[PDB]
Amino acid sequence: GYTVAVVGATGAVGAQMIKMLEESTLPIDKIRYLASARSAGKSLKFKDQDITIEETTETAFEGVDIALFSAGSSTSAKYAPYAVKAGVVVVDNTSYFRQNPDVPLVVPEVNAHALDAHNGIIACPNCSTIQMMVALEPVRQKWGLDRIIVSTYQAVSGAGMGAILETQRELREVLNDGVKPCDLHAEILPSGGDKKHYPIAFNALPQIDVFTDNDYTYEEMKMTKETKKIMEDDSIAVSATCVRIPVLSAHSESVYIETKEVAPIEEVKAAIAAFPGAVLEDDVAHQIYPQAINAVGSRDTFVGRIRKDLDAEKGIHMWVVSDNLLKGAAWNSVQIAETLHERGLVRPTAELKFELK
Amino acid sequence: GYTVAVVGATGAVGAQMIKMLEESTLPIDKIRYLASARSAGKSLKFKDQDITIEETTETAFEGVDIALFSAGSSTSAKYAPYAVKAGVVVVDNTSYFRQNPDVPLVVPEVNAHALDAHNGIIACPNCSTIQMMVALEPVRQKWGLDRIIVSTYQAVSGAGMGAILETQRELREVLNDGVKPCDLHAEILPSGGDKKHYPIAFNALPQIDVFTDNDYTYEEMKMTKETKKIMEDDSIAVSATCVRIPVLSAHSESVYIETKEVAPIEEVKAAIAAFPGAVLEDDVAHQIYPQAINAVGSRDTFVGRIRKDLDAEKGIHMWVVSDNLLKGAAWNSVQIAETLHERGLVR
Numbered sequence: 198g199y200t201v202a203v204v205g206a207t208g209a210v211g212a213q214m215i216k217m218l219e220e221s222t223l224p225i226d227k228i229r230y231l232a233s234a235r236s237a238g239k240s241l242k243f244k245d246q247d248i249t250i251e252e253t254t255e256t257a258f259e260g261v262d263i264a265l266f267s268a269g270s271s272t273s274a275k276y277a278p279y280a281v282k283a284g285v286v287v288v289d290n291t292s293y294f295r296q297n298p299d300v301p302l303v304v305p306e307v308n309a310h311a312l313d314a315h316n317g318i319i320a321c322p323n324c325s326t327i328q329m330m331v332a333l334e335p336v337r338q339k340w341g342l343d344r345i346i347v348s349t350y351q352a353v354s355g356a357g358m359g360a361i362l363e364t365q366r367e368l369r370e371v372l373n374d375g376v377k378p379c380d381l382h383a384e385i386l387p388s389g390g391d392k393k394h395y396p397i398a399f400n401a402l403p404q405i406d407v408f409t410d411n412d413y414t415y416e417e418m419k420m421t422k423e424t425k426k427i428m429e430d431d432s433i434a435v436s437a438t439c440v441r442i443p444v445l446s447a448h449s450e451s452v453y454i455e456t457k458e459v460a461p462i463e464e465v466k467a468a469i470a471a472f473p474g475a476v477l478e479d480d481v482a483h484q485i486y487p488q489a490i491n492a493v494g495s496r497d498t499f500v501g502r503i504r505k506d507l508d509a510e511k512g513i514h515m516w517v518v519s520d521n522l523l524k525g526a527a528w529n530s531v532q533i534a535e536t537l538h539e540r541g542l543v544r545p546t547a548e549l550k551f552e553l554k
Numbered sequence: 555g556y557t558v559a560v561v562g563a564t565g566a567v568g569a570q571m572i573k574m575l576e577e578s579t580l581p582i583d584k585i586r587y588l589a590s591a592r593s594a595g596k597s598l599k600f601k602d603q604d605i606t607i608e609e610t611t612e613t614a615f616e617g618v619d620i621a622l623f624s625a626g627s628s629t630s631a632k633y634a635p636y637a638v639k640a641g642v643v644v645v646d647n648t649s650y651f652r653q654n655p656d657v658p659l660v661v662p663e664v665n666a667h668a669l670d671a672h673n674g675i676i677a678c679p680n681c682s683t684i685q686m687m688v689a690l691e692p693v694r695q696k697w698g699l700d701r702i703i704v705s706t707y708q709a710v711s712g713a714g715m716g717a718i719l720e721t722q723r724e725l726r727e728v729l730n731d732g733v734k735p736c737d738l739h740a741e742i743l744p745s746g747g748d749k750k751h752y753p754i755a756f757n758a759l760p761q762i763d764v765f766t767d768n769d770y771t772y773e774e775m776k777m778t779k780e781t782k783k784i785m786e787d788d789s790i791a792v793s794a795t796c797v798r799i800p801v802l803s804a805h806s807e808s809v810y811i812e813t814k815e816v817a818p819i820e821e822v823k824a825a826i827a828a829f830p831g832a833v834l835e836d837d838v839a840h841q842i843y844p845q846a847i848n849a850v851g852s853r854d855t856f857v858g859r860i861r862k863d864l865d866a867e868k869g870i871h872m873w874v875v876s877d878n879l880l881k882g883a884a885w886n887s888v889q890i891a892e893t894l895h896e897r898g899l900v901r
């Protein structure tokens with residue numbers, strides 16, 4: 198069996214990492230929960246066992262076979278390289294290593310083969326990217342993809358526990374105390390790293406992450422760059438708009454694509470149905486389509502509203518929904534670890550390829 | 555002045571029509587409030603003066619100069635032709651007449667000229683179409699429009715006062731009683747006129763109105779058809795995805811366009827700023843962009859996140875926000891009535 202560590206065990210993703218591990222096919226001999234100094238000494242369950250939480254440090258990874266990181270990019274930057282040096286295989290949820298050419302960026306249903314060449318770190322893509330890749334890969338395999346335009350409808354749990362509690366508080370102030378939305382005080386959203394903060398209650402915020410130089414956000418640009426790496430095709434054009442809405446869990450996405458060859462609409466639907474990890478939920482005659490509230494708690498990615506563009510011959514619109522803390526994060530990560538186990542890839546790396554900070 | 559009638563004065567839109575008329579430059583001598591058989595008798599205000607709500611009948615429109623209809627297709631299909639008969643000029647908020655080739659479909663800042671050809675009835679377009687037209691007309695004027703792709707983020711107030719209440723009750727049950735969103739009971743959304751109902755609380759519902767043969771909803775097809783008619787150009791390719799989200803008032807839209815000639819972004823921003831009814835709010839260095847919660851109560855349409863596509867030479871993305879009961883409905887209507895007055899078309 199393995200020694201498995203969860204870095205960021207106390208966070209929103211971490212909680213789901215624990216659940217996914219509890220329900221895993223991974224043979225686990227020993228579990229370790231890591232967080233900041235603040236949580237160290239506190240206790241948390243793994244199934245029935247009480248596990249004492251430890252401080253994450255340069256020296257915390259001795260004896261660990263697999264570490265799952267979900268404690269922000271800065272934490273992965275500081276400590277993941279030390280875990281690799283110690284002989285750990287790291288599965289990282291953060292953005293920090295995703296564009297490093299020595300790091301596979303993996304959704305197992307799409308590009309599991311890229312795991313073969315890892316050097317101790319495997320990166321999980323951004324939550325919004327993962328579910329879009331699950332929906333579109335089966336289409337790409339058969340008809341190709343020329344371009345993608347996507348508008349996202351993103352739940353607040355992606356920004357962490359703080360963001361969840363802030364959203365709950367704001368809704369309660371409005372609905373129970375009669376505070377007007379524009380009078381609400383916010384501290385976290387749209388981005389903890391940015392200067393100004395805005396209410397999410399009864400709002401739609403077209404900012405996720407900070408702005409980059411080209412006036413897209415980092416979240417938008419992550420979708421673009423991650424898509425091309427995962428699909429191994431820099432020729433695919435991708436432009437995104439990423440919007441936070443008042444949803445606690447499950448991202449939805451309005452996705453437009455143009456295929457390389459015309460894709461018969463009903464075959465597109467069949468291909469998506471046949472693809473592992475994707476569930477076709479598309480029957481408009483009976484008002485059947487993916488919804489955020491029904492996706493919460495499932496590892497599947499749900500696709501519907503599938504239809505031709507009204508004018509573009511190769512154009513197709515769809516609606517994609519998935520639990521952003523499961524396939525979007527914790528489940529993708531644990532699925533990666535299971536795949537590494539199944540293919541004999543859980544072993545220390547020969548050469549260190551990551552700078553110690 | 556004029557005798558003005560508000561049909562459906564008790565509803566979500568009706569209540570705003572009253573506010574807009576109260577604040578209007580339209581010279582009003584008498585105001586009449588019309589609704590259904592079971593509102594008939596109560597009293598609504600016009601400024602500080604009581605108005606008896608009257609039932610809407612075939613004969614209740616005699617003596618009326620201008621009638622503002624906001625009470626669903628049903629009410630407008632039956633009673634508006636009788637109002638035109640009685641010499642009334644009708645401004646219709648509903649979808650019923652919108653594609654009638656004898657009925658102008660008007661956003662005043664865009665195609666006011668179309669009011670000249672009217673024959674008793676003016677159609678106000680759909681809320682989500684109007685704000686899109688205000689934002690895009692200035693770009694079309696200067697560089698053309700080849701195609702539009704839009705994904706909307708629509709507030710619940712567009713589906714009626716009943717939808718607003720269902721939303722607030724649903725949210726309270728989740729946050730106060732701990733009910734799981736997927737277990738909530740729903741009566742209205744996504745569509746009051748469709749077979750099944752779903753919760754909106756902590757949800758996003760990809761259905762506005764009912765479905766058509768081509769698997770787009772009627773809301774989506776209205777955006778497509780009304781755009782062509784308002785801009786008087788059938789060659790503009792338009793496809794929409796319309797989504798309800800847990801917002802009470804103000805629609806937002808993620809809008810993608812391709813122009814006919816390349817349009818420099820700074821010139822695009824300047825053209826929208828210059829266009830009447832559009833306000834530029836776009837300064838990402840200070841996280842300035844349009845937001846539903848700030849747009850509530852304003853007649854303006856707000857545009858930002860304006861940026862070029864990363865690959866398409868003529869492609870442009872933007873974010874457009876406006877109060878759906880104001881510019882999206884009541885203010886557009888009252889603006890039409892004011893325009894008719896000013897251009898001497900109320901006869």
Ligand SMILES: Nc1ncnc2c1ncn2[C@@H]1O[C@H](COP(=O)(O)O)[C@@H](O)[C@H]1OP(=O)(O)O
Nearest residue numbers: 205206207208209232233235236253268357358
């Ligand atoms: N310097 C750090 N070292 C290790 N873990 C950290 C550090 N800073 C934050 N974390 C962890 O990242 C996660 C953040 O989750 P979320 O964003 O959902 O709150 C938490 O588990 C948090 O632990 P802690 O709870 O000890 O602060």
Ligand SMILES: Nc1ncnc2c1ncn2[C@@H]1O[C@H](COP(=O)(O)O)[C@@H](O)[C@H]1OP(=O)(O)O
Nearest residue numbers: 562563564565566589590593610625629714715
């Ligand atoms: N058959 C009808 N004749 C006239 N008005 C109607 C009829 N049915 C509904 N209405 C009005 O349409 C509006 C709908 O409002 P909303 O869409 O916000 O629920 C209300 O003012 C309602 O008035 P009433 O209050 O009498 O039902």
Ligand SMILES: O=C(O)c1cccc(C(=O)O)c1C(=O)O
Nearest residue numbers: 269270271291292293323324355
């Ligand atoms: O570290 C963060 O602050 C963070 C927070 C939410 C999402 C992400 C991510 O890129 O998926 C990230 C990130 O890894 O950059």
Ligand code: NA
Nearest residue numbers: 470471472475
């Ligand atoms: Na499948």
Ligand code: NA
Nearest residue numbers: 700789790791
């Ligand atoms: Na065209």
Ligand code: NA
Nearest residue numbers: 827828829832
């Ligand atoms: Na302007």
